[PDB]
Amino acid sequence: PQITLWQRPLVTIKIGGQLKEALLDTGADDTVLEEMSLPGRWKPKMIGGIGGFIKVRQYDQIPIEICGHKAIGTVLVGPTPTNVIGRNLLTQIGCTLNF
Amino acid sequence: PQITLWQRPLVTIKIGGQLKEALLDTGADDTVLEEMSLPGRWKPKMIGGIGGFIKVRQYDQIPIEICGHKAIGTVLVGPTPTNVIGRNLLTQIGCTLNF
Ligand SMILES: COC(=O)N[C@H](C(=O)NN(CCC[C@@]1(O)Cc2ccc(cc2)C/C=C/CNC(=O)[C@H](C(C)C)NC1=O)Cc1ccc([C@H]2C=S=CC2)cc1)C(C)(C)C
Ligand SMILES: [Cl-]
Ligand SMILES: [Cl-]
Ligand SMILES: [Cl-]
């Protein structure tokens, strides 16, 4: 698809069999979701945003569908204000910025 | 241009007679720059991201040039950890996400 930016670029993702809404964010290195359960072991990560730093749980090699495009990669889980899909997954689904 | 997302999508902007580097951020409603002087009226605003909120000054109708493309819009100025170009200016240079 081609997504213009007059509204927030919110898309449906699927992860762990569940649909969620998430924001496609080219300004984010990483993908970070609101509290949820994921399988396996996690590692610690501190990520920085506009307001400061939060601690999140890092899960690797997680399957996630983004607008129907399949990806498998690192998902961070923590107290984010919204679900955000960052460049780690945007690259997997072949996203670019164009003007 | 077509901008890949293997790396952070940094561009040069011209604003208030200054050249600055900024991040093209489809997840940002607003454009926020580190402390700088701008002409004209402003009003205070709180903006939120990962890590919580910061207080910024909101300047309206500011001319900016981004990768050779002229636009005009609201620019927020304050203690942001990095310069971000948000959707309010990305729309004006005809920037889209594609995959
Ligand atoms: C390299 O680290 C990162 O990629 N951080 C990422 C990130 O925050 N990077 N930044 C992109 C902006 C994040 C976000 O689009 C992400 C975002 C957060 C909240 C919301 C939407 C989108 C809902 C709140 C509504 C309105 N909020 C915003 O639109 C704000 C803008 C006012 C900035 N939008 C955002 O803050 C900008 C940003 C980049 C770097 C840094 C750091 C540099 S040094 C320490 C931090 C801070 C902010 C992230 C998501 C993993 C925490
Ligand atoms: Cl990844
Ligand atoms: Cl504007
Ligand atoms: Cl358009």
UniProtKB/Swiss-Prot annotation, chains A, B:
Dimerization of protease, as annotated region: 1-5, 49-55, 88-99
Parts of the chain that traverse the membrane: none
S-S pairs: none
Limits of the Peptidase A2 domain: 20-89
Active site: D25
Function (record text): Aspartyl protease that mediates proteolytic cleavages of Gag and Gag-Pol polyproteins during or shortly after the release of the virion from the plasma membrane. Cleavages take place as an ordered, step-wise cascade to yield mature proteins. This process is called maturation. Displays maximal activity during the budding process just prior to particle release from the cell. Also cleaves Nef and Vif, probably concomitantly with viral structural proteins on maturation of virus particles. Hydrolyzes host EIF4GI and PABP1 in order to shut off the capped cellular mRNA translation.
Assembly mode: Homodimer, whose active site consists of two apposed aspartic acid residues.
Protein name per its UniProtKB record: Protease
